[PDB]
Design an enzyme around this catalytic site. Structure first.
Site, PDB file in Angstrom:
ATOM      1  N   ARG A  20      38.124  35.519  36.069  1.00  0.00           N
ATOM      2  CA  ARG A  20      38.795  36.328  34.113  1.00  0.00           C
ATOM      3  C   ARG A  20      38.673  34.564  33.441  1.00  0.00           C
ATOM      4  O   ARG A  20      37.760  34.778  32.895  1.00  0.00           O
ATOM      5  CB  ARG A  20      39.891  37.223  34.228  1.00  0.00           C
ATOM      6  CG  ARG A  20      39.176  38.469  34.946  1.00  0.00           C
ATOM      7  CD  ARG A  20      41.065  40.009  34.514  1.00  0.00           C
ATOM      8  NE  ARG A  20      41.331  38.918  35.086  1.00  0.00           N
ATOM      9  CZ  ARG A  20      42.503  39.618  35.674  1.00  0.00           C
ATOM     10  NH1 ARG A  20      42.662  40.263  35.520  1.00  0.00           N
ATOM     11  NH2 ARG A  20      43.597  38.649  36.538  1.00  0.00           N
ATOM     12  N   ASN A  38      39.262  43.464  35.344  1.00  0.00           N
ATOM     13  CA  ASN A  38      38.785  43.174  37.159  1.00  0.00           C
ATOM     14  C   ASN A  38      38.726  45.633  36.851  1.00  0.00           C
ATOM     15  O   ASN A  38      39.335  46.083  36.125  1.00  0.00           O
ATOM     16  CB  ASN A  38      40.606  43.356  37.444  1.00  0.00           C
ATOM     17  CG  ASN A  38      40.352  41.937  37.686  1.00  0.00           C
ATOM     18  OD1 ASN A  38      41.232  41.358  38.537  1.00  0.00           O
ATOM     19  ND2 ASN A  38      39.327  41.107  38.167  1.00  0.00           N
TER      20      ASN A  38
END
Length: 91
Positions: A20, A38
């Site tokens: 990320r 996620n």
């Protein structure tokens, strides 16, 4: 089409590898707005920007956003533009 909005699901070794955080740097490089998250054991992205920038962004992510990542598969869907997006966020 000058701009695109995409749904990108990335699969493989894509959690516990800074995916990320590394995706955010790619979004900044190519002037991309949207989100990285996620989801279950994979990563979901919404990404909007100019056509070539979206191409650059997709490649940077699927070639392994993180050096620790191994992207095995991805799914891409072309979306209608989302005019409420103004930045790129890790959620």
């Amino acid at each position: 089409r000058h701009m695109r909005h995409i749904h990108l699901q990335v699969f493989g070794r894509v959690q516990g590898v800074g995916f990320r955080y590394f995706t955010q740097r790619i979004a900044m490089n190519y002037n991309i707005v949207g989100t990285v998250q996620n989801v279950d054991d994979y990563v979901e992205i919404y990404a909007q920007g100019d056509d070539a920038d979206i191409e650059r962004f997709i490649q940077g992510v699927i070639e392994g956003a993180s050096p620790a990542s191994n992207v095995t598969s991805h799914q891409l869907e072309e979306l209608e533009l989302n005019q409420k997006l103004s930045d790129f966020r890790s959620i």
